[PDB]
Amino acid sequence: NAFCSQFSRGVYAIFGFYDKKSVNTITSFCGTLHVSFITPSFPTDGTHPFVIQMRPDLKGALLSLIEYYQWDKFAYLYDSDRGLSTLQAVLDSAAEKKWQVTAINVGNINNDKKDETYRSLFQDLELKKERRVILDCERDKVNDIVD
Amino acid sequence: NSIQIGGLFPRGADQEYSAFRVGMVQFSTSEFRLTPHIDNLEVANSFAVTNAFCSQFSRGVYAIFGFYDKKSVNTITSFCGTLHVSFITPSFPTDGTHPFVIQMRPDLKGALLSLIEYYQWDKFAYLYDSDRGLSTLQAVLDSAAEKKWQVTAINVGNINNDKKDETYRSLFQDLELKKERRVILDCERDKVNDIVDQVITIGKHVKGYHYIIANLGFTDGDLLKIQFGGAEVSGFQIVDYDDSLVSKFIERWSTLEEKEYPGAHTATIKYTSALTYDAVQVMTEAFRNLRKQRIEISRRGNAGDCLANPAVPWGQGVEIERALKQVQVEGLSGNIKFDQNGKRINYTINIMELKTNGPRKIGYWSEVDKMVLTEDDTSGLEQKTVVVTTILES
Amino acid sequence: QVITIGKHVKGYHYIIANLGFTDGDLLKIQFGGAEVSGFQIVDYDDSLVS
Numbered sequence A: 001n002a003f004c005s006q007f008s009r010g011v012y013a014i015f016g017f018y019d020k021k022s023v024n025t026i027t028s029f030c031g032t033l034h035v036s037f038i039t040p041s042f043p044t045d046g047t048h049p050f051v052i053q054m055r056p057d058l059k060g061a062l063l064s065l066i067e068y069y070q071w072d073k074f075a076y077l078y079d080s081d082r083g084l085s086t087l088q089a090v091l092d093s094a095a096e097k098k099w100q101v102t103a104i105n106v107g108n109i110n111n112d113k114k115d116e117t118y119r120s121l122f123q124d125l126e127l128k129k130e131r132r133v134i135l136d137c138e139r140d141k142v143n144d145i146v147d
Numbered sequence B: 001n002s003i004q005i006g007g008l009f010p011r012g013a014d015q016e017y018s019a020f021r022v023g024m025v026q027f028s029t030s031e032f033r034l035t036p037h038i039d040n041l042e043v044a045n046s047f048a049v050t051n052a053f054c055s056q057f058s059r060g061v062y063a064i065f066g067f068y069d070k071k072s073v074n075t076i077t078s079f080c081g082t083l084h085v086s087f088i089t090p091s092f093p094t095d096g097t098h099p100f101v102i103q104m105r106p107d108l109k110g111a112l113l114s115l116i117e118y119y120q121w122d123k124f125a126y127l128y129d130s131d132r133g134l135s136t137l138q139a140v141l142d143s144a145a146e147k148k149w150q151v152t153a154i155n156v157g158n159i160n161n162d163k164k165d166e167t168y169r170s171l172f173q174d175l176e177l178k179k180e181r182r183v184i185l186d187c188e189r190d191k192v193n194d195i196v197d198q199v200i201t202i203g204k205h206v207k208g209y210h211y212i213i214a215n216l217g218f219t220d221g222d223l224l225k226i227q228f229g230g231a232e233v234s235g236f237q238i239v240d241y242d243d244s245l246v247s248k249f250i251e252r253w254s255t256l257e258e259k260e261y262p263g264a265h266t267a268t269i270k271y272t273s274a275l276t277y278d279a280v281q282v283m284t285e286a287f288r289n290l291r292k293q294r295i296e297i298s299r300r301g302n303a304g305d306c307l308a309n310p311a312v313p314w315g316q317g318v319e320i321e322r323a324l325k326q327v328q329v330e331g332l333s334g335n336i337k338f339d340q341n342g343k344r345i346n347y348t349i350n351i352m353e354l355k356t357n358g359p360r361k362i363g364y365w366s367e368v369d370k371m372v373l374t375e376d377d378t379s380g381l382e383q384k385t386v387v388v389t390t391i392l393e394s
Numbered sequence C: 001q002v003i004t005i006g007k008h009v010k011g012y013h014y015i016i017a018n019l020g021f022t023d024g025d026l027l028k029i030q031f032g033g034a035e036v037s038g039f040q041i042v043d044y045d046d047s048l049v050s
């Protein structure tokens, strides 16, 4: 609605944000109606025309950092909010570079009792004595984990 | 009594639509008739799906049956939730609790994890396809932390098909560094045959390898090829051809003219198509339980534009949901029941193994009983030991 | 048949006893692993044949 509303008002370009759920709506409409969409949100997983992305791809910088510290076995706590684009990145590279990645979706954790979950989270991260963790989350979900 | 409904069929869903037609005939009554308005659009395209939905909504439908992709799924779940429109689909279950959505496909995530423990797997390769969402991928990865597994997940989806050979060779090259002999194929009926064919070519289908087809259509694909190879192949079957109910369906299905009913002249049926047929039955029993319940919901083709702002949900939709979700009949996919959300419950998924004589059910999986093996044990195995007699003499 | 039973993998060695080695389809038992030898009378490397 917000898109069609701004479109009926006759705009020349649209600046906004999208989620892992609404991203497809934007990329699709903007491509059909030839409307330009500028967004700071996470980059689209593919080549969607009429979309300007302010956020650079971190996927590359991350993989490079892992090799720098020479990591072979690490835990990868991810959040499905910005798409599993980076998750697939480390998993696919784990095949080539031969890594033992322990991916764990720290996203679907219900926040009104999220404690017996973290205790059971680092309980699995102790079976293999994981000492190297990668936090792929938002500025908020990170502080929760850090705490 | 004319009940207008919407039908969103992706271009290529021949057998699915054929099964949709047969259902209209088998479940047609004098009390009321269903009027399907078919719209063949590219299910992947989110924009097109939006139009097809608003179009069927302006035409004033009471319910919508169709399909969605990993991309357009959010559009459907969202609109149907806002406009209180019911959406029945055989497609993959939604990752969450989205109201006004009826899902014909049971969750395989549970049956898969149970099978892995049965074979006692600790290190296996997991070739997945991002088409049906990474819902099952997250399942095995999260369980890999608890059950302590060494999973080698590889996205076999983004493989460009106009040169997809130097990719498979480089795929099983990584699956040889750790000498992976146990692979789980989480793909569609098509992407599976492609892999199976490649497997036979490179000769990784001989004794020593173990494949698991992570879909509800184990017998839906061609197995005659990797049947005599030697490698053990397991999978899941939702359409039990041993049920007199299903057996009777095939008796009439296999005879139907393939001209009028595309891809319908076979002894088997894709689980997606079987769910479509069962979908019609659910919609019938639902609209029937509303007539016998003395509930008026009827309207006209003037619901208005779906983009109407503010968008006002027609109260008659709330009852249509409580109807479909309350339905409980017997179909091709076993006992059909639903919860308050729309996810199927109290269902049964047969665990299958591929032997020399062909596929064979070794047990089933219940949401409440986990895995339960049925008779089949080739008892015994030369157990006939040797009786050694001896005397007690130091 | 050889490919079906899987006797075309590394360890097996076949010899096609005819003058037409490239006359038949070899793309099938080419990536199997088993070594395959034969005989060719029509040299496609000759400028005459080429």
Ligand SMILES: *[C@@H]1O[C@H](CO)[C@@H](O)[C@H](O)[C@H]1NC(C)=O
Binding pocket: B335, B346
């Ligand atoms: C659950 O499913 C079984 C098998 O179809 C059925 O017999 C039973 O009635 C169901 N249970 C209830 C309480 O509905």
